Design a protein around this ligand. Structure first.
Ligand SMILES: *[C@@H]1O[C@H](CO)[C@@H](O)[C@H](O)[C@H]1NC(C)=O
Ligand SMILES: *[C@@H]1O[C@H](CO)[C@@H](O)[C@H](O)[C@H]1NC(C)=O
Length: 354
């Protein structure tokens, strides 16, 4: 029931299913305690009092290790899975964790649940080029102006709708453990209520990797970073041209591009279906790609923009190499010297006789 087409076969927008993409994926952390085994300490406030409690981190005897998988795994609110770096780690040392998504994804949110008090200075970066460069996604720092040099909670008007602003809420110690930091990408952008026609916010959510630079916790002799469950929610960027993604031959995640579009993200038109410039599948117009018209006399075609504009943005469909002794934009008329045969249709393999 491919919903990427409606009842009577018409193309209509379709986007995949919202998932915990983080779920089950590997995180390349910058620190995991246990080797060599080491000392850490946890505060447990009971009433007025503060119960200092210290246990050891040893990797090669597993139960007291803290691997990256605790993050993206089944989190169950009893058996809670807190990853934990090497304790005693400070400023100005980029505790950079890096996740590899696997395909262009338009991210709704990024949420972290801390077992240690929510750090003071962290920052969400993002990579749209698949781990080649990085950019400020959103900052957290009770001292924003110094640390990340950004203004503390910058305002987002029509001119910086892609500047990561820098906040300081939920950067608070309490609760010691359990502090969840839920960042919404599109949150606070003046044109969020029209993402279908906001190509810039469509670029603000376009992400391929995520980097997290912890620079500083709070100033409480052990102290560390521990996180329980990590979720990167979002759908698969198919430009509204596929309602599900799948990995292919040599295992690489690409869309199920419909609408005669081509590409991993459907960004372009499949060969021959260049009759209309690829556009974004929005709320009402699939803006699908369309096969040219050659009357079955050709196999390839380009796209002429005058003929689009000069037609009034209708079709730039120009056939390449009309076979079967025809010619013309739509192979719609015989070659020179070959007369047309009224007994045979234009699409015949001998519609044109000598
Ligand atoms: C966690 O898993 C172990 C499995 O042996 C179980 O004993 C324990 O009760 C579970 N949950 C908690 C809250 O300890
Ligand atoms: C820390 O930041 C510096 C900035 O020059 C960079 O070169 C380095 O790779 C970063 N290190 C880590 C561990 O992220």
């Amino acid at each position: 029931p491919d919903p990427c087409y409606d009842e009577h076969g018409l193309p209509r927008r379709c986007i995949p299913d919202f998932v915990n993409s983080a779920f089950g994926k590997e995180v390349k952390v910058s620190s995991t305690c246990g080797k060599p085994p080491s000392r850490y300490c946890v505060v447990t406030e009971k009433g007025e009092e503060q119960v200092r409690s210290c246990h050891l981190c040893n990797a090669s005897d597993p139960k007291r290790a803290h691997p990256p998988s605790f993050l993206t795994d089944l989190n169950n609110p009893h058996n809670l899975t807190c990853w934990q770096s090497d304790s005693y780690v400070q400023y100005p040392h980029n505790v950079t964790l890096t996740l590899s998504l696997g395909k262009k994804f338009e991210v709704t949110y990024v949420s972290l649940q801390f077992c240690s008090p929510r750090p003071e200075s962290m920052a969400i970066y993002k990579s749209m080029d698949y781990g080649k460069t990085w950019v400020p996604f959103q900052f957290y720092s009770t001292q924003c102006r110094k640390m990340y040099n950004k203004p503390s909670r910058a305002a987002i008007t029509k001119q910086n709708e892609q500047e990561a602003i820098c906040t300081d809420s939920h950067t608070d110690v309490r609760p010691l453990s359990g502090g969840l930091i839920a960042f919404s990408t599109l949150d606070g952008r003046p044109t969020a209520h029209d993402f279908d026609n906001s190509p810039v916010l469509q670029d603000w959510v376009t992400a391929t990797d995520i980097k997290v630079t912890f620079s500083r916790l709070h100033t409480f002799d052990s102290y560390f970073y521990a996180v329980s469950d990590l979720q990167v929610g979002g759908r698969c960027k198919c430009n509204g041209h596929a309602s599900r993604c799948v990995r292919d031959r040599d295992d690489n995640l690409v869309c199920d591009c419909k609408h005669n579009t081509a590409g991993p993200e459907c960004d372009r038109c499949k060969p021959f279906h260049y009759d209309r410039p690829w556009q974004r599948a929005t709320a009402r117009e699939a803006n699908e790609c369309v096969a040219c018209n050659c009357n079955l006399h050709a196999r390839r075609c380009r796209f002429n923009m005058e003929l689009y504009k000069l037609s009034g943005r209708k079709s730039g469909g120009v056939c390449l190499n009309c076979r079967h002794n025809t010619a013309g934009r739509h192979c719609h008329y015989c070659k020179e010297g070959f007369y047309r045969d009224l007994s045979k249709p234009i699409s015949h393999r001998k519609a044109c006789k000598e």
